């Protein structure tokens, strides 16, 4: 059924699964027209499709041309997501196809189920968690590749960098979600934390800085402080 706090460890078992987040697929800027009316301008999006055991992120870039001449774009966007997720599974050899796909928003369930009717043995599941995957566009390298795209494109990232050499996938996933929650709550502060120290670099091919274990504990603690704080500054506590 639904994925929640009670069955969190299932994400790190050996059944192949993917998270799918569609929160960045249809992105707009809202502006005034010359006549003083309001209009939107679409910008490039992406589907965030992530294996939480391995860190594999299949980042499908949604180029603005896909919306040209279409109506009901917020609704289309859910079906476009589902169509793109289904051809990724089809493309994959059988032993690499997921046993489960967990959607981060419930409105994705029927679009994905319909596009996956050919795969009755792949369970489509919602979740009760409030996962911060929308903040993926606050990761600079991901944002850059989305915005520069001139055509539809699939870009592959390990969103855990090399962390699995040293920590488990439970710990990696909990680090990722903490970084993303922080970026989502106060992007500016979150980014200051990660890049304050000029000596800690992001090796070209990684998304995050090359922290030592001890440095990751400092960082992880600084991100928790940020999240408690902003919760205060938001709730006055």
């Amino acid at each position: 059924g639904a994925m929640n706090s009670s069955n969190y460890a299932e994400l790190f078992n050996n059944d192949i699964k993917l998270f799918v987040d569609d929160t960045n697929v249809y992105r707009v800027t809202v502006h005034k027209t010359f006549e003083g009316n309001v209009a939107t301008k679409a910008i490039n999006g992406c589907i965030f499709t992530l294996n939480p055991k391995t860190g594999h992120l299949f980042l499908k870039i949604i180029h603005t041309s896909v919306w040209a001449g279409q109506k009901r774009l917020s609704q289309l966007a859910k079906w476009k997501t589902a169509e793109e997720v289904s051809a990724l599974v089809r493309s994959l050899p059988k032993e690499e196809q997921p046993k489960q796909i967990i959607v981060t928003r419930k409105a994705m369930l029927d679009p994905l189920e319909v596009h996956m009717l050919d795969f009755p043995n792949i369970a489509i599941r919602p979740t009760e968690l409030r996962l911060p995957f929308s903040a993926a566009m606050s990761i600079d390298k991901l944002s850059d590749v989305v915005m520069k795209a001139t055509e539809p494109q699939m870009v592959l990232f390990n969103i855990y960098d090399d962390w699995l050499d040293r920590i488990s996938s439970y710990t990696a996933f909990s680090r990722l979600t903490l970084l993303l929650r922080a970026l989502k709550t106060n992007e500016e502060s979150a980014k200051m934390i990660l890049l304050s120290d000029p000596t800690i670099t992001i090796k070209s091919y990684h998304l995050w800085p090359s922290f030592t274990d001890e440095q990751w504990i400092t960082i992880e603690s600084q991100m928790r402080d940020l999240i408690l704080t902003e919760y205060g500054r938001k709730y006055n506590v």
Binding site: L76, W79, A82, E83, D110, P111, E113, V114, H115, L117, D118
Partner: protein, 300 residues
């Protein structure tokens, strides 16, 4: 005008004949139902006094044979049987009529309710839904499950309604996933009407039969089927105009006939609010919407 005689009424029972019903007491001198209008199917149904569990009954057409009811004390129900000896039947009925031991089918002459509820129901199609080919009449009860229900357990005692499933390959063309899921016209017009039912009369017949089994027997899988066949029309942007007009009449009389105190279980909130207020056909069911709003505004 035809007759369904009874051997006797050994157990106290409420007897329904179409939309009518009457109480018979244990061993009351009752010998059946006369003046049944020819030209329509009919149902005669039963609810024992001792066990309001299991409403059951028999779909029949008096043009297809001479049928009578006889209580079976082994199986514990009133059973329909066919009499093949025509002169034995006439003679038995004539005696019962002379002794005035039959109730008369109480049809008001202005009243077209039954016709309106059974306009497209034909015994031949009933018998394909209810498979028991050695009999000309069809037994239904509250507990019988549908073929679609059994896919989710005795095949012989099932209701073989046409399976409708909106999230199925039958319903969704490869490459038209969003289009076909949000506008079911393909599934309605090509798969079901042209493919399976052949015409809208057969479709409407199954829909009417499903409603009648839900209403007379509280048969849950029938109620699911009725709502599914409404929702498939209402969720199609392209429906022949004549089908829309007829559907409105059909549902109007179903809503009019439903017992006021069964509406809570027999009517699906989600389906009706969608059909009347959100669907493509939200503006096409004027008579049904007006009777629903005046009679069951709480559901909406």
């Amino acid at each position: 005008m035809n007759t369904v005689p009874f051997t006797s009424a050994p157990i106290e029972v409420t007897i329904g004949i179409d939309q009518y019903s009457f109480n018979v007491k244990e061993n009351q001198p009752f010998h059946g139902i006369k003046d049944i209008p020819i030209g329509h199917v009919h149902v005669i149904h039963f609810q024992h006094a001792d066990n309001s569990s299991m409403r059951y009954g028999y779909w029949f057409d008096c043009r297809m044979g001479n049928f009578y009811i006889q209580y079976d004390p082994k199986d514990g129900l009133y059973k329909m049987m066919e009499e093949r000896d025509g002169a034995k039947f006439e003679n038995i009925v004539h005696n019962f009529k002379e002794r005035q031991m039959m109730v008369s089918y109480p049809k008001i002459d202005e009243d077209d309710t039954w016709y309106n509820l059974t306009e497209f129901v034909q015994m031949d199609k009933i018998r394909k839904i209810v498979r028991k080919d050695e009999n000309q009449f069809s037994y239904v009860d509250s507990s019988m499950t549908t073929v679609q229900e059994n896919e989710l357990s005795d095949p012989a005692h099932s209701l073989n309604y046409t399976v409708i499933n909106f999230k199925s390959r039958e319903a969704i063309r490869p490459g038209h996933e969003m289009e076909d899921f949000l506008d079911k016209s393909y599934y309605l017009n090509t798969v079901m009407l042209q493919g399976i039912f052949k015409n809208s009369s057969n479709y409407f017949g199954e829909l009417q039969f499903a409603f009648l089994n839900a209403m007379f027997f509280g048969n849950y899988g029938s109620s699911l089927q009725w709502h599914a066949m409404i929702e498939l029309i209402c969720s199609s942007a392209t429906v022949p105009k004549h089908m829309l007009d007829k559907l409105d009449e059909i549902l109007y009389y179903q809503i009019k006939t439903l017992p006021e105190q069964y509406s809570d279980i027999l009517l699906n909130e989600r389906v009706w609010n969608i059909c009347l207020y959100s669907s493509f056909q939200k503006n096409s069911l004027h008579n049904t919407e007006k009777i629903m709003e005046n009679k069951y505004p709480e559901l909406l």
